[PDB]
């Protein structure tokens, strides 16, 4: 009132998520479908789901830098050491790709190449 | 006075600065007043590229929070009350803010009426001009401002 | 004493509750063990985390009695 | 797990949809752009049409 | 007792166990003293294995719900008090807890210093180690707990 700012408390910059699972529902089977819309204090975003016991994951993930990456794995929930998987998006440089175990499509500023 | 000076040299030079143009918070690096080429400028960094011609200084991007406690104003009116009759008395250079949430300001000229800039909001093309009070008297908001140099440092 | 005294600790008619405090934590549940949480402390920092598959909500502990 | 943006120009049901444009990740790993003529199609090896 | 002789065998070995790594909530299902290859072990999982190696078999993953009703430990001292004085009396062998909302433990060893993973959240490579309780005691907590087995079941 007095013509003065108000202060936030802690200026470090936080980290949301939004954790969503569940137990069960009404067709009986176990509720195993883990999703997240984390964002971290770096300003990276991270939309993911999960299937915990079938260790399967998709992820749509924004780096600070500003890298567009979606990426989905078959056999491990952890983006590290993943086998079989599946990648397309925008490196960190300015370069579109979809790369996966196989030699990826590239499409660089300029050309194309394989 | 320094303010009211001012404020007659922008309305006499105001036909000949349609180079400046309308944007949100615009601040260039560029004088509009040195440069030929046109250049998107807001009321505050207008104001701002005005009084620093002259000896004053004042500071940059010279937001909504430079006049809390730099101590180069004093209220004349306070915000929350709104008369018509009073209008009158005020004098040329007065500072007039517009929008609930301070969003505008402007500057008084007689005759009923003041100059900004006005547009739709995404970087509009209209130059500056200048617009009758009677319209904009819903969104004046009650605030009133004035310099003072002779005081300060 | 405000890490702790401060605190606007309050339950809904359901039993997934609400929380707010005086530092950057802030935790919000809903049905089953979903949840929404924020904070900037590095210490504070596994309350909010989505590592491999997040923190589980017994980690918490604002999810106590 | 399925990436998927679909656009729709004469429905706004997803089903029966006459002018639609697809691309993304389908259950199976296949990156793929599909619309109402034939497909374009990256499998993990390999390229189709 | 069996904690303080377990605690004594981990101090002793603690230069030797350079392969466990430290990771937020690394339950690998290999035991890490079986093994040569480096494995990634949170402590509470380094407790359940150290504690396994025994008759003892304790439960997995062995998080913080562990310590409210399974009845294997009793409080020593509670949470929202802190006194340096008081740490002496401590034994070798009782948990430490660490964090505003039990983050990480740690276990007590003599000579005022405990050990701990202590490390960057994002799986760190720093190996285990023993730190000085004085830079770490200000986010001690309070919470001590000891074991007990000769009457459980």
Same mark, same amino acid.
């Given at each position: #009132?007095?013509?003065?700012? @108000? /202060?936030?408390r ?14 069960? !529902? ?12 984390? @964002? ?20 749509? /993930? ?6 567009y990456?979606? @990426?989905?794995?078959?056999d491990?929930?952890?983006?590290? /050491? ?5 990648? !397309? #998006? ?6 579109? !790709?979809?790369?996966?175990d ?9 050309? @194309? !190449?394989? | ?15 000949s600065?349609?180079?400046?143009? =309308? ?5 260039? *690096? ?24 002259? +000896? ?6 010279m ?9 180069? &104003?004093?209220?004349?009116?306070? *915000? ?14 007065? %500072?007039? &803010? ?12 007689? +005759?009923?009426?003041? %100059?900004?800039?006005?547009? *739709?909001?995404?970087? +509009?093309?209209?130059?500056?001009? *200048? =617009?009758?009070? +009677?319209? =904009? ?17 | ?11 809904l008619?359901?039993?997934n ?7 950057? $934590?802030?935790?919000? $549940? ?8 924020? $904070? ?21 502990? $604002?999810?106590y009695?």
């Open positions: #009132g007095n013509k003065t700012l @108000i /202060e936030p802690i200026q470090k910059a936080p980290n949301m998520l939004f954790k969503h699972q569940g137990v069960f !529902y009404d067709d009986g089977t176990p509720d195993n479908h883990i999703t997240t819309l984390f @964002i971290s204090e770096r300003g990276d975003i991270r939309a993911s789901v999960l299937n915990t016991e079938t260790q399967k994951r998709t992820t749509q /993930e924004m780096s600070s830098d500003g890298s990456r979606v @990426i989905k794995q078959d491990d929930l952890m983006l590290d /050491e993943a086998q079989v998987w599946i990648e !397309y #998006g925008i490196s960190e440089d300015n370069k579109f !790709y979809i790369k996966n196989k030699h990826k499509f590239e499409f660089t500023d300029e050309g @194309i !190449y394989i | 006075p320094l303010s009211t000076i001012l404020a007659l040299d922008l309305n006499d030079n105001l036909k600065l349609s180079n400046i143009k =309308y944007m949100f918070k615009g601040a260039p *690096k560029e004088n509009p007043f040195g440069t030929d080429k046109d250049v998107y400028i807001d009321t505050y960094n207008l104001l701002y590229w005005l009084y620093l011609g002259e +000896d004053e200084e004042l500071a940059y991007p937001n909504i929070n430079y006049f809390f406690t730099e101590g180069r &104003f004093f209220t004349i009116f306070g *915000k929350g009350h709104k008369y018509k009759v009073d209008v009158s008395k005020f004098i040329v250079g007065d %500072i007039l &803010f517009f929008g609930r949430s301070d969003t505008n300001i402007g500057i008084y000229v007689g +005759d009923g009426e003041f %100059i900004s800039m006005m547009g *739709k909001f995404p970087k +509009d093309e209209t130059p500056i001009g *200048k =617009y009758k009070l +009677d319209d =904009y008297w819903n969104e004046f908001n009650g605030r009133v401002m004035r310099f003072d140099e002779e005081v300060y440092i | 004493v405000y890490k702790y005294s401060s605190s606007l600790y309050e339950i008619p359901s039993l509750y609400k929380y707010d405090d005086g530092e950057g $934590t802030s935790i919000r $549940t809903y049905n089953g063990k979903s949840f929404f949480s924020m $904070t900037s402390g590095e210490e504070e920092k596994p309350q909010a985390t989505d590592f491999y598959t997040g923190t589980e909500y017994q980690d918490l502990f $604002t999810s009695y």
